[PDB]
Design a protein around this ligand. Structure first.
Ligand SMILES: Nc1nc2c(ncn2[C@@H]2O[C@H](COP(=O)(O)OP(=O)(O)O)[C@@H](O)[C@H]2O)c(=O)[nH]1
Ligand SMILES: [Mg+2]
Length: 166
């Protein structure tokens, strides 16, 4: 069993918790406490290898955490999450990317850009815009819905596959 340490980052309210819960429980939770920050395990076979994913679902601002600090430092890959109907969350991605570059002292860090809430109509962030951002970072862009499960496995398993290239 191979362990992969994943960290889910992004603005409050974009569906970080919902994404993680969908992966773990196969259910959509719409009222997950915005302040609960914790790590979760998922045993799953990815491309023939039995993996134990260790996933930190980050939560909170202008306050420190021993667990989050540890995961930022030792995390092997990052899901950088915005919502396709939250323009500010997309614009925030730059600062999450800069934080990750600083924590790792590198511009070459396993990362996937995730545009969540893709089940809702009238997106305010175009696929093209997100693809452009991911291209500028040299990373994949994957759209997801924690509600319908669209893209959820894709996003997490792609991140594992990105780590394996490192
Ligand atoms: N329709 C829809 N709602 C979502 C999706 N993901 C999250 N939500 C809702 O968006 C809100 C914020 O989700 P949450 O997981 O708490 O975001 P977090 O602050 O990033 O952890 C909640 O009301 C969720 O029900 C999605 O893919 N589709
Ligand atoms: Mg949350």
């Amino acid at each position: 069993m191979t362990e992969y340490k994943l960290v889910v980052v992004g603005a409050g309210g974009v569906g970080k918790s919902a994404l993680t819960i969908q992966l773990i429980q196969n259910h959509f939770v719409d009222e997950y406490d915005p302040t609960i920050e914790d790590s979760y395990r998922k045993q799953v076979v990815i491309d023939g290898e039995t993996c134990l994913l260790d996933i930190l679902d980050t939560a909170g601002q202008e306050e420190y955490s021993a667990m989050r600090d540890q995961y930022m430092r030792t995390g092997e890959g990052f899901l950088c999450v915005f919502a396709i109907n939250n323009t500010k969350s997309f614009e925030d991605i730059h600062q999450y990317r800069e934080q990750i570059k600083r924590v790792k002292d590198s511009d070459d860090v396993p990362m996937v850009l995730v545009g969540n809430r893709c089940d809702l109509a009238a997106r305010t962030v175009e696929s093209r815009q997100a693809q452009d951002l991911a291209r500028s970072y040299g990373i994949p862009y994957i759209e997801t819905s924690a509600k319908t499960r669209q893209g959820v496995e894709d996003a997490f398993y792609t991140l594992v596959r990105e780590i394996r290239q490192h």
